[PDB]
Symmetry: none
Subunit: 115 residues, 3 copies
């Protein structure tokens, strides 16, 4: 078996051994339920799972959030507000200035931005 593999397994194993199990187990269980809940996805330290799955679950959860916020300028305000953090991540990621990015989003749509 590859040395890098072995040392990594060695590591996660060794680190699991020198930790209080009952505490660990409660923490692992909490992270698990929080992950598998799949609904308030945009606040979930999620993006924990495999990329090809989360990616699609991303587009999925966009449609759903839109469904739940639609009951007109107000509906878009709701959609925007649930994605504030997300939207900032898009800017950090496309090498653009947050603030500028939010503001443009707000101008192009009838939304009041966090910047």
């Amino acid at each position: 078996m590859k040395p890098q593999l072995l040392a990594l397994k060695q590591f996660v194993q060794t680190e699991f051994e020198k930790v209080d199990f009952e505490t660990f187990r409660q923490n692992f269980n909490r992270c698990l339920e929080r992950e598998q809940s799949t609904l308030l996805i945009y606040e979930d330290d999620d993006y924990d799972d495999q990329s090809f799955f989360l990616k699609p679950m991303l587009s999925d959860a966009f449609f759903i959030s839109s469904e739940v916020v639609k009951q007109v300028k107000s509906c878009c305000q709701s959609f925007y507000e649930a994605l504030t953090l997300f939207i900032s991540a898009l800017a950090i990621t496309k090498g653009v200035d947050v603030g500028r990015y939010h503001q443009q989003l707000g101008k192009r749509f009838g939304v009041l931005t966090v910047y």
Copy 2:
């Protein structure tokens, strides 16, 4: 008897009678079937079982995770991709570890990936 033990019993007992049986029954059978699959221990709402069994299954399943991802063979397989797969399966496990040792999740993950050549979730 011991009154406290009594109440605990009275509670889950009463709890059980005031829930739709047939709906409970299915979740129970589903949870069970889920607990007893023995393979994806790391996403398993598991850690339900007793610590003596869980703790060993832990080391057990690691040995197995490592064996199934090390697709270098002697038809080759690079070092990063193999370690990437071992990590991508332990992601949730790794954050808990961090929560548990009072470490900044995120930094924990990042150190992990620097030490071993892995593309981490943080």
Copy 3:
């Protein structure tokens, strides 16, 4: 100066001095020009330049290929067709992927074909 470095320079320097210059020049100039056209990046004897620059020239060229194969025109291309053209321009590249991770080429190509609606080379 590091003797190993000196030997290394000595070698390419000497190898250069005893080769037909004019034939060398055309070849250098032809490799350099093919290298600098940057767009048909996935068939260029490329992955000649530094890793850090190549790594993102890579991801950047991906984005470009994605916008150059999409002729949806809002008249149309159509999902199936645009992905196919994306897949066929990456055919060799995809094989390098499966080779590198020690996975069976073909099996890899086929999975890619079933995950998306692409007719594969294998």
